[PDB]
Amino acid sequence: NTVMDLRGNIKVMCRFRPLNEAEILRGDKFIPKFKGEETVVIQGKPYVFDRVLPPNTTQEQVYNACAKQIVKDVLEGYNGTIFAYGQTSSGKTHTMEGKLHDPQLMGIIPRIAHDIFDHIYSMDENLEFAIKVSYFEIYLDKIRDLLDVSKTNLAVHEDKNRVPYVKGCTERFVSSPEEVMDVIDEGKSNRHVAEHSSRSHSIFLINIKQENVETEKKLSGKLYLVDLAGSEKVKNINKSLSALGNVISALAEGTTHVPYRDSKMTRILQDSLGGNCRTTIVICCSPSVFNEAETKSTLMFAA
Ligand SMILES: Nc1ncnc2c1ncn2[C@@H]1O[C@H](COP(=O)(O)OP(=O)(O)O)[C@@H](O)[C@H]1O
Numbered sequence: 001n002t003v004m005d006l007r008g009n010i011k012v013m014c015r016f017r018p019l020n021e022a023e024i025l026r027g028d029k030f031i032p033k034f035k036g037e038e039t040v041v042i043q044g045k046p047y048v049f050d051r052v053l054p055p056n057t058t059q060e061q062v063y064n065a066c067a068k069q070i071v072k073d074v075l076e077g078y079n080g081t082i083f084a085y086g087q088t089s090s091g092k093t094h095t096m097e098g099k100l101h102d103p104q105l106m107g108i109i110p111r112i113a114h115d116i117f118d119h120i121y122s123m124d125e126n127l128e129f130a131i132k133v134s135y136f137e138i139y140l141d142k143i144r145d146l147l148d149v150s151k152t153n154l155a156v157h158e159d160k161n162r163v164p165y166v167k168g169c170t171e172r173f174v175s176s177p178e179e180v181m182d183v184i185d186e187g188k189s190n191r192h193v194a195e196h197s198s199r200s201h202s203i204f205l206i207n208i209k210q211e212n213v214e215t216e217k218k219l220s221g222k223l224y225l226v227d228l229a230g231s232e233k234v235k236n237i238n239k240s241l242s243a244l245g246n247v248i249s250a251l252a253e254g255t256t257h258v259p260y261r262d263s264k265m266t267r268i269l270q271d272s273l274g275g276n277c278r279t280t281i282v283i284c285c286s287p288s289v290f291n292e293a294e295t296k297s298t299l300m301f302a303a
């Protein structure tokens with residue numbers, strides 16, 4: 001959807017982060033200019049987005065602009081993806097997970113958590129839910145499961161009925177917002193070390209299933225939260241982000257065939273990416289000169 005027009009439904013948003021302690025000491029010039037709620041400029045000719053989020057924008061502000069709508073109709077049987085993009089340091093991980101237990105500094109995923117268990121708990125009623133989550137990285141084109149260090153190079157089969165999935169990826173049923181937090185921690189705790197996260201894609205899946213206890217009828221929704229690896233140029237390739245780009249721009253033209261198979265990632269996410277779905281990309285940029293290099297690359301990744 002009652003708040004989603006058209007097969008996609010790709011929105012691109014642009015969070016600029018504040019200059020940090022280093023950058024201010026150094027005396028970094030500050031390059032971006034903000035015309036309105038959607039436009040940003042550097043040197044010349046604009047970039048237009050669904051939304052621009054200047055340094056001042058709070059997490060709670062970011063959540064409402066990017067996630068809250070997606071959350072509502074996952075609870076109504078639809079699939080959704082939220083991407084965080086940008087060079088290393090831009091604030092992708094600030095945006096997606098934040099400080100998990102500060103009520104003010106926590107990012108999207110914890111906020112999605114609290115949100116979910118609040119629609120659910122203002123009602124049931126006759127609705128009984130099963131919420132399971134999967135947490136896995138894609139490093140060097142292999143699918144490492146962050147919930148089970150046994151599993152690396154996991155395999156992408158295509159289901160029964162046409163569309164891809166990830167065989168035998170650990171699932172972990174949760175039932176409180178903090179149990180959702182736990183799974184993020186568990187994975188951070190299984191996650192390889194030696195920057196490593198700076199060079200691998202994090203996929204966080206929240207699978208909500210619900211059944212009516214009388215009518216018996218049931219809905220299923222999937223919400224993927226993805227923390228993409230830095231887009232900079234200066235642990236390899238990252239043709240991946242190009243496959244991603246290829247998919248998005250394709251959807252947003254109204255051709256007919258979409259380069260899903262071009263990467264493991266766009267293969268997996270295919271059923272939560274395009275058509276009936278919502279996909280919001282949060283591209284994250286630094287306002288410094290010292291990163292204007294990538295800032296502009298990052299900026300035109302979208303269209
Ligand atoms: N919008 C913001 N407001 C305040 N601090 C931020 C913001 N964005 C990033 N930071 C801080 O700057 C650093 C870089 O963020 P990070 O999420 O690690 O970027 P990336 O994930 O792209 O490497 C972190 O210490 C983070 O907490």
Ligand SMILES: [Mg+2]
Nearest residue numbers: 092093197198
């Ligand atoms: Mg990061």
